[PDB]
Amino acid sequence: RKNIFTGKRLNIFDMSLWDVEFAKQLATVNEQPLQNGFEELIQWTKEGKLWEFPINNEAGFDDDGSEFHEHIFLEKHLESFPKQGPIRHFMELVTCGLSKNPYLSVKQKVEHIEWFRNYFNEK
Amino acid sequence: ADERLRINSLRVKRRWRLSRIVFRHLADHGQLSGIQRA
Amino acid sequence: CTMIRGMVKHRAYEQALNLYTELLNNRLHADVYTFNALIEATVCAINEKFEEKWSKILELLRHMVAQKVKPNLQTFNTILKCLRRFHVFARSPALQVLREMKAIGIEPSLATYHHIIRLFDQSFIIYDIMNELMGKRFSPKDPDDDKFFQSAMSICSSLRDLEL
Amino acid sequence: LHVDVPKDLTKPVVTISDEPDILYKRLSVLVKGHDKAVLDSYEYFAVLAAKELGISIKVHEPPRKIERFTLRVQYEMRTLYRCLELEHLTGSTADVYLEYIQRNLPEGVAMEVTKTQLEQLPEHIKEPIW
Numbered sequence: 001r002k003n004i005f006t007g008k009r010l011n012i013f014d015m016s017l018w019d020v021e022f023a024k025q026l027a028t029v030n031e032q033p034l035q036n037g038f039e040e041l042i043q044w045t046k047e048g049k050l051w052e053f054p055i056n057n058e059a060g061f062d063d064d065g066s067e068f069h070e071h072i073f074l075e076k077h078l079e080s081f082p083k084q085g086p087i088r089h090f091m092e093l094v095t096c097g098l099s100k101n102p103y104l105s106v107k108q109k110v111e112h113i114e115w116f117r118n119y120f121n122e123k
Numbered sequence: 124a125d126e127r128l129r130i131n132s133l134r135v136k137r138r139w140r141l142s143r144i145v146f147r148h149l150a151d152h153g154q155l156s157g158i159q160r161a
Numbered sequence: 162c163t164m165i166r167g168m169v170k171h172r173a174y175e176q177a178l179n180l181y182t183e184l185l186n187n188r189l190h191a192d193v194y195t196f197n198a199l200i201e202a203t204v205c206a207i208n209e210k211f212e213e214k215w216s217k218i219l220e221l222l223r224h225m226v227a228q229k230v231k232p233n234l235q236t237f238n239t240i241l242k243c244l245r246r247f248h249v250f251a252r253s254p255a256l257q258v259l260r261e262m263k264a265i266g267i268e269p270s271l272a273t274y275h276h277i278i279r280l281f282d283q284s285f286i287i288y289d290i291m292n293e294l295m296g297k298r299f300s301p302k303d304p305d306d307d308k309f310f311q312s313a314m315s316i317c318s319s320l321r322d323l324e325l
Numbered sequence: 326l327h328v329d330v331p332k333d334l335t336k337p338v339v340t341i342s343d344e345p346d347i348l349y350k351r352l353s354v355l356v357k358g359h360d361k362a363v364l365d366s367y368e369y370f371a372v373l374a375a376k377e378l379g380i381s382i383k384v385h386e387p388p389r390k391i392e393r394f395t396l397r398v399q400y401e402m403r404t405l406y407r408c409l410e411l412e413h414l415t416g417s418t419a420d421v422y423l424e425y426i427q428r429n430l431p432e433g434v435a436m437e438v439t440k441t442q443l444e445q446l447p448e449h450i451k452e453p454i455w
Contacts, residue, residue: 003289003292004256004259004260004286004289004290005259005260005263005289005293006260007256007257007260008257008260009257009260009261009264010219010222010257010258010261011261012222012223012226012261013226013231013232013261013265014265015265015266016163018163018166018194025304026301026302026304027301028304029301029303029304029306029307030301030307053423053424053427053428054420054423054424054427054438055427112125112129115125115129116129119129136396143396146396147396147398150400156359156433157359157402157403157404157433158400158402159400159401159402159403160398160399160400160401161393161399161400161401
């Protein structure tokens, strides 16, 4: 007349690929077919096939964690160029043009500046 | 693209990407979205 | 450890026991999963009666505590699955295993109740199991968990109880 | 389901963070379509959802646009509009409402959501530098 969780016990205690496959076959015990459309949408969202809502038009894009000062102030890369000549004028204009380019990353702008540096160095 | 631009700086139904005949064929069938002939 | 687990998986039980013996001879320690595999091998060894096999399981468990290795859910589930093979003689040991597993602080899984129910269905323990499990939400912990409900339903068919 | 019903259901976990919520003065949802009936049905849907979620909504119809082009064989494209201004809604309410109505956006209809967040002056601008 007593519940099965009371009685004699052992009393002996007191308080790689193997793991990967173990977890994979744990995944199976709760592997049932989709039961309706909402579950299908949830499954695809978890898989990442579906867009996130509300739509963020810049989702998955962070521009390498760049800051605005790295895009708008690009004149620090013109230090190795002439400081008061006509090349200074042309490069100031070029960096003004690059700083107003929203389609380019900072890396592309700096490599443009470096190409100009190299071309003038050869000449 | 960048290389050719740098030197330069110092100095038909293409709207839908279809052949002009084909665009008529598609649009007559109603296939294109919102292209209603008037 | 991996060599023992491999041999047990591919049914080289005697070889697994031997490699465990040179494992001990090398003063090396075995992990939990290897102890589960050795339990499987001990029960699957041929030509031994229930009492000797049960004593050997207890001896492996004594070695496991001697090596400071703590059991997990898989150890007790393996013990119960192994123990299913010994029909009526195994019922009181099965209760003792479940009570020990509860006492140590390991929570029961669906596979545990599945194995116990299938051991006894060969029957009022199902009422106690349901009384414990009513209202509880489960998570995947053992490969045999999915086999619980089926087995439980079979019991409800054999006892002819609709409320259960 | 007359007898077999789910006994309990997993409500999703919505935790009340400590970070203060965004505040939107206005939220203009301009929906564009080739069909006026789809836009009317979507207007009914969005308005009903807005009334039930407590959001204040006002609807109007911006003027239709026409793109006419000849290849003689002449083709035409219609763009009809419906603008839904929500007012005085917080960040979470706006986000959930937008998720709902954008997941339920009918075929061939695009959306342009303009959000006007309310913010305070930066502390740098409260007084001049000395």
